[PDB]
Amino acid sequence: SLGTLLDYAAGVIPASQIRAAGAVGAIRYVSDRRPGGAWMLGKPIQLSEARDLSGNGLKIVSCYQYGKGSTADWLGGASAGVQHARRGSELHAAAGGPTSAPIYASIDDNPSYEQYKNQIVPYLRSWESVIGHQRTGVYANSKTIDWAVNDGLGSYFWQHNWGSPKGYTHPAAHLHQVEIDKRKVGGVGVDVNQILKPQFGQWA
């Protein structure tokens, strides 16, 4: 690793506490709170929080996840992709996120090849059609990252371990989620991510 990035949905953490926890920045949501998700005070990142993080010399990265499970964003394929990508782009810009920075679209699942080809490919192609190939990031397991890389879908890859081989890091991944909810920072549960490549989608 080149440093740690934290991700969290339950609340907003003062940048001084992210820095005190040993992280060099955070991966933050450019998404709304779904029904049943009003507790996700960490969604979406606001301009004031982005200014706090950057102010303390911390890195910022954008990710998108609205639904989950039975309401996973990618289920609706192309039509779902344009609706979610537009909103993510709008929220990223509202928090002062530059258009030179990507947004990591979430595949918070362990899909089959059938789900990938029939639903995730049109979903991710819609993200590319809205914000561009160069701005399309993908949060997925290493199997899904490999399928996307092999298809030339997406430019940034953030590996999760649900459906990835034990102890494996995909050689194309920019970021790797290595720990889920095993830490609390400023009263908020956080996930830990390792930076693998020097250009990983940081705003600055």
Tab-separated table of C-alpha atoms in Angstrom:
chain	number	residue	atom	x	y	z
A	1	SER	CA	0.000	0.000	0.000
A	2	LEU	CA	0.783	3.730	-0.749
A	3	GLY	CA	-1.461	4.804	2.146
A	4	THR	CA	-4.948	4.161	3.543
A	5	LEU	CA	-8.313	5.683	2.570
A	6	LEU	CA	-11.357	5.279	4.793
A	7	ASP	CA	-14.915	4.797	3.583
A	8	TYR	CA	-18.050	5.226	5.751
A	9	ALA	CA	-21.785	5.810	5.412
A	10	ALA	CA	-23.022	6.303	9.022
A	11	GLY	CA	-21.770	9.856	9.552
A	12	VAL	CA	-19.393	12.695	8.743
A	13	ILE	CA	-15.988	12.571	10.403
A	14	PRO	CA	-13.910	15.708	11.206
A	15	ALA	CA	-10.886	15.608	8.850
A	16	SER	CA	-8.567	16.043	11.896
A	17	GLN	CA	-9.859	12.667	13.184
A	18	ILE	CA	-9.365	10.928	9.767
A	19	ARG	CA	-5.785	12.237	9.788
A	20	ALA	CA	-5.325	11.222	13.506
A	21	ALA	CA	-6.450	7.642	12.601
A	22	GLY	CA	-3.510	7.328	10.182
A	23	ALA	CA	-5.431	7.593	6.904
A	24	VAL	CA	-4.280	9.851	4.047
A	25	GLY	CA	-7.879	10.537	2.940
A	26	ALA	CA	-11.365	9.175	2.408
A	27	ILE	CA	-13.567	7.608	-0.328
A	28	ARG	CA	-16.873	9.418	0.006
A	29	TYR	CA	-20.408	8.981	-1.325
A	30	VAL	CA	-21.798	11.164	-4.068
A	31	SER	CA	-25.222	9.468	-3.537
A	32	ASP	CA	-28.581	10.133	-1.910
A	33	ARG	CA	-29.944	8.192	1.064
A	34	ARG	CA	-32.357	5.460	-0.103
A	35	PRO	CA	-35.653	4.803	1.801
A	36	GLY	CA	-34.652	3.104	5.066
A	37	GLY	CA	-31.275	4.882	4.796
A	38	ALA	CA	-31.928	8.215	6.652
A	39	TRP	CA	-29.298	6.965	9.225
A	40	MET	CA	-26.625	7.247	6.470
A	41	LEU	CA	-25.513	10.748	7.469
A	42	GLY	CA	-22.345	10.101	5.442
A	43	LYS	CA	-24.397	10.336	2.207
A	44	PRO	CA	-23.791	12.557	0.217
A	45	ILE	CA	-20.502	14.333	0.924
A	46	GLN	CA	-21.211	18.101	1.258
A	47	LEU	CA	-18.981	20.983	0.085
A	48	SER	CA	-18.077	21.923	3.743
A	49	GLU	CA	-16.782	18.369	4.436
A	50	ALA	CA	-14.726	18.337	1.166
A	51	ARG	CA	-13.214	21.700	2.216
A	52	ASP	CA	-12.383	20.238	5.683
A	53	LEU	CA	-10.675	17.153	4.176
A	54	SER	CA	-8.648	19.131	1.554
A	55	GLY	CA	-7.851	21.770	4.220
A	56	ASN	CA	-6.137	19.121	6.381
A	57	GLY	CA	-4.105	17.892	3.360
A	58	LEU	CA	-6.297	14.790	2.978
A	59	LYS	CA	-7.120	13.019	-0.330
A	60	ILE	CA	-10.710	12.731	-1.530
A	61	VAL	CA	-12.156	10.065	-3.822
A	62	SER	CA	-15.785	9.794	-4.984
A	63	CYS	CA	-17.934	6.651	-5.003
A	64	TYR	CA	-21.568	6.027	-5.745
A	65	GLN	CA	-23.996	3.615	-4.108
A	66	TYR	CA	-27.672	4.326	-3.770
A	67	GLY	CA	-29.473	0.948	-3.536
A	68	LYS	CA	-28.423	-2.460	-2.172
A	69	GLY	CA	-29.349	-6.134	-2.602
A	70	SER	CA	-32.857	-6.320	-4.119
A	71	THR	CA	-32.479	-2.586	-5.083
A	72	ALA	CA	-28.768	-2.782	-6.224
A	73	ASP	CA	-28.150	0.083	-8.665
A	74	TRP	CA	-26.951	-2.141	-11.541
A	75	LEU	CA	-30.118	-4.329	-11.697
A	76	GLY	CA	-31.833	-1.832	-14.054
A	77	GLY	CA	-28.979	-1.948	-16.596
A	78	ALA	CA	-28.700	0.951	-19.102
A	79	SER	CA	-31.795	2.902	-17.969
A	80	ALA	CA	-30.691	2.673	-14.292
A	81	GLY	CA	-27.127	3.635	-15.242
A	82	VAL	CA	-28.055	7.023	-16.750
A	83	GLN	CA	-30.286	7.996	-13.792
A	84	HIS	CA	-27.644	7.062	-11.181
A	85	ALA	CA	-24.682	8.495	-13.172
A	86	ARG	CA	-26.411	11.858	-13.653
A	87	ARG	CA	-27.129	12.113	-9.911
A	88	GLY	CA	-23.607	11.072	-8.921
A	89	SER	CA	-22.156	13.668	-11.317
A	90	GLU	CA	-24.457	16.374	-9.846
A	91	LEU	CA	-23.572	15.499	-6.209
A	92	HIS	CA	-19.841	15.240	-7.009
A	93	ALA	CA	-19.913	18.753	-8.585
A	94	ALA	CA	-22.045	20.161	-5.676
A	95	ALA	CA	-19.359	19.009	-3.159
A	96	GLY	CA	-16.692	20.838	-5.264
A	97	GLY	CA	-15.489	17.653	-6.975
A	98	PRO	CA	-13.636	18.387	-10.250
A	99	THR	CA	-14.626	16.816	-13.621
A	100	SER	CA	-10.996	15.564	-13.866
A	101	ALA	CA	-11.834	13.187	-10.995
A	102	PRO	CA	-13.640	9.823	-11.562
A	103	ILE	CA	-16.613	8.404	-9.683
A	104	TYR	CA	-16.467	4.805	-8.542
A	105	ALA	CA	-19.874	3.214	-9.441
A	106	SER	CA	-20.675	0.402	-6.959
A	107	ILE	CA	-21.240	-3.276	-7.781
A	108	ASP	CA	-21.852	-4.206	-4.069
A	109	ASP	CA	-22.498	-7.841	-5.071
A	110	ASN	CA	-20.860	-11.107	-6.172
A	111	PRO	CA	-22.464	-11.455	-9.622
A	112	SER	CA	-22.553	-14.327	-12.102
A	113	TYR	CA	-21.211	-13.868	-15.658
A	114	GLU	CA	-24.898	-13.800	-16.787
A	115	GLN	CA	-25.634	-10.827	-14.426
A	116	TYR	CA	-22.468	-9.046	-15.549
A	117	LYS	CA	-23.137	-9.396	-19.310
A	118	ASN	CA	-26.886	-8.779	-19.158
A	119	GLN	CA	-27.112	-6.027	-16.506
A	120	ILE	CA	-23.717	-4.694	-15.281
A	121	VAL	CA	-22.251	-4.110	-18.803
A	122	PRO	CA	-25.190	-1.797	-19.914
A	123	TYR	CA	-25.163	-0.228	-16.371
A	124	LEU	CA	-21.420	0.648	-16.562
A	125	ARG	CA	-21.673	1.677	-20.281
A	126	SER	CA	-24.398	4.226	-19.151
A	127	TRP	CA	-21.949	5.598	-16.562
A	128	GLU	CA	-19.384	5.975	-19.424
A	129	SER	CA	-22.016	7.703	-21.571
A	130	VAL	CA	-22.806	10.238	-18.845
A	131	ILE	CA	-19.424	11.125	-17.267
A	132	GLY	CA	-17.021	9.465	-19.781
A	133	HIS	CA	-14.844	6.334	-19.952
A	134	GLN	CA	-11.928	8.194	-18.260
A	135	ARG	CA	-14.180	9.129	-15.269
A	136	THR	CA	-15.851	5.738	-14.801
A	137	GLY	CA	-14.641	3.887	-11.717
A	138	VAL	CA	-15.842	0.457	-10.632
A	139	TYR	CA	-16.114	-0.887	-7.035
A	140	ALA	CA	-16.412	-4.664	-7.495
A	141	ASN	CA	-14.777	-7.997	-6.592
A	142	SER	CA	-11.625	-9.050	-8.533
A	143	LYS	CA	-13.606	-11.406	-10.849
A	144	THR	CA	-15.896	-8.531	-11.935
A	145	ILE	CA	-12.905	-6.170	-12.273
A	146	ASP	CA	-11.279	-8.718	-14.603
A	147	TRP	CA	-14.396	-9.003	-16.767
A	148	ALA	CA	-14.638	-5.152	-16.977
A	149	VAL	CA	-10.896	-4.761	-17.775
A	150	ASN	CA	-11.160	-7.486	-20.453
A	151	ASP	CA	-14.193	-5.594	-21.984
A	152	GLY	CA	-12.511	-2.177	-21.777
A	153	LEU	CA	-15.236	-0.994	-19.339
A	154	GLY	CA	-14.189	1.590	-16.783
A	155	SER	CA	-10.838	3.269	-16.115
A	156	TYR	CA	-10.489	2.962	-12.300
A	157	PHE	CA	-10.941	-0.182	-10.225
A	158	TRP	CA	-11.570	-0.532	-6.480
A	159	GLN	CA	-11.516	-4.128	-5.321
A	160	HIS	CA	-13.861	-5.582	-2.676
A	161	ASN	CA	-13.362	-9.106	-1.307
A	162	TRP	CA	-16.861	-10.607	-1.709
A	163	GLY	CA	-16.095	-13.111	-4.453
A	164	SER	CA	-12.346	-12.362	-4.682
A	165	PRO	CA	-9.748	-15.159	-4.003
A	166	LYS	CA	-8.377	-15.075	-0.407
A	167	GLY	CA	-5.322	-12.800	-0.030
A	168	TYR	CA	-5.500	-11.659	-3.680
A	169	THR	CA	-5.110	-8.145	-5.056
A	170	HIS	CA	-6.067	-7.668	-8.755
A	171	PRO	CA	-3.029	-6.197	-10.651
A	172	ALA	CA	-5.338	-3.642	-12.369
A	173	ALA	CA	-6.880	-2.307	-9.090
A	174	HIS	CA	-6.135	1.291	-7.990
A	175	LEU	CA	-7.688	0.730	-4.526
A	176	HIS	CA	-8.392	-2.363	-2.410
A	177	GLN	CA	-10.951	-2.633	0.424
A	178	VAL	CA	-9.057	-4.749	3.009
A	179	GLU	CA	-11.168	-4.347	6.213
A	180	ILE	CA	-14.913	-3.935	6.786
A	181	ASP	CA	-16.296	-2.224	9.932
A	182	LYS	CA	-13.362	-3.283	12.181
A	183	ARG	CA	-12.636	0.276	13.210
A	184	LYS	CA	-14.550	3.288	14.597
A	185	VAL	CA	-13.244	6.837	13.905
A	186	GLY	CA	-14.967	9.834	15.557
A	187	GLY	CA	-17.838	7.523	16.633
A	188	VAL	CA	-18.345	6.261	13.034
A	189	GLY	CA	-17.721	2.719	11.726
A	190	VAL	CA	-15.195	2.785	8.856
A	191	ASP	CA	-13.842	0.453	6.181
A	192	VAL	CA	-10.150	0.482	5.345
A	193	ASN	CA	-8.830	0.740	1.792
A	194	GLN	CA	-5.236	0.417	0.518
A	195	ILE	CA	-3.980	2.666	-2.294
A	196	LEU	CA	-2.183	0.549	-4.945
A	197	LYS	CA	-1.435	2.984	-7.768
A	198	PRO	CA	-0.239	6.632	-7.588
A	199	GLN	CA	-3.117	7.904	-9.815
A	200	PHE	CA	-6.143	6.397	-8.006
A	201	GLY	CA	-8.942	8.911	-8.633
A	202	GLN	CA	-8.024	11.587	-6.071
A	203	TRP	CA	-9.707	14.934	-6.582
A	204	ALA	CA	-6.276	16.648	-6.102
